């Protein structure tokens, strides 16, 4: 009876972070539909992404980015401006200041990288799908480095790409909305792993968000179960481990919820 | 130990119906962002109502409605034109037709009533809040009655009300998602009650969608507990009855998610 009722507990988890992730991912699909439509003045579209934030404190940053000349055929007036490239592109890129009231602005980066802090840009470009990112360090004005995840939406209509829009979740923030929870009568801890295996909460070792799954054992267990997409447990010294998979959007990556309960 | 397993159970069917509401609601909220600071052309604004229910079969409609003049200035060019009124508001309803495949455009209906079938414009106009309708009835082409819920957001900034944009949802086919799920071991009822005590869902008798709770007595009751937000249960003949509340998005009413479960 025990096991029952600790096995719908970590259900119970897993559905309240999937909402909560669905949420954001849900704002950002519904922001695209305009924009694959219309081509709206650049400051316009600059004030929607910034509104999204006023209103809106869970999240982190609402990035855009085009290819090049695909909003309004017009990047060479903007060379060198902010949110621009220099060969002007459009990629604004809206964030948090020094306090939650400020929003700043800045031009997008990595959206050519092939390293990870690019995959927000390249992987929805690559396969046309909607994208949560992998966690990654995201530099900002000032040489500060931003630990994130960005829930992506490709700008993609009549069967062709013209690039993406962003929520990006601040991990620090969801540590603590999400990884200091106590699942199981105040015991326990709650984790959340990205497809790759990278922590982007973790009730056991705060020390641990943005790391992969240490051992390497583990981390080969970890990536072949979590991509067939059915619940799993494992146990260790203490604790009894349940692990759903699950998808945030239309995405079609598992990312996955631990819920680790003691044996006492 | 079994009540803490059924109580658990509850609670996960509640984030459960609740992650798919608000993506729905996310999806409507990011939506309204690009047109809270930009008036693309008429036609192009239809175009991405359409795109949300192409992309999206979960959703029967979606629907704009502006104040007189306030998308462009320009209504009376529009007059007695497809999706507008006779003084040529801008007031698009795209929705499912003869097939799920067909999406058909008319003018938003009873945005002037202060019946409940007006309850989706006036209620974001009045109170400035996001808003999930109570289930109504709602007539489209054809002479059809089609019985929904809206999830309604104000375009709202700067102080000022401009308007609506809803998504919505057939309640024949919530009730098909939902409503026919057995909550526990393939046993109990689903049911999803709205602010007003209206069923939205219901497992037990399904001629009950879109009425009212029918004995007074557990009208009046329904009405008190479900908002004061704390979960409640009763007993019937037969069953323990778990009720939920919670809310949509950003609305402040409260929902409840019923989960019935027999004694046995
Ligand atoms: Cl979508
Ligand atoms: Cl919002």
Redesign the interface.
Known sequence: ??H??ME??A??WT??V??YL?????????????????A??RN??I???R??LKVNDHYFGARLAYEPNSLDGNDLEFQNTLGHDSTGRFIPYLHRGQTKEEIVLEDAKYYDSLGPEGDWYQVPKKTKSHYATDPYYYEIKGKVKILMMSLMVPLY?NDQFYGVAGLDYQLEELQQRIGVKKPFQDLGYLTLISPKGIYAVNGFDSNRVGEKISDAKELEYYLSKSQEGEKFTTDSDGYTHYYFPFHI?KDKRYWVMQVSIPNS
């Open positions: 009876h025990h029952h009722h719908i507990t259900e119970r559905y309240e999937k909402d669905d949420t954001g991912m849900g704002i950002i699909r519904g922001f695209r539909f305009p924009l694959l439509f219309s709206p003045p316009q579209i004030a929607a992404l509104e999204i209509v959007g």
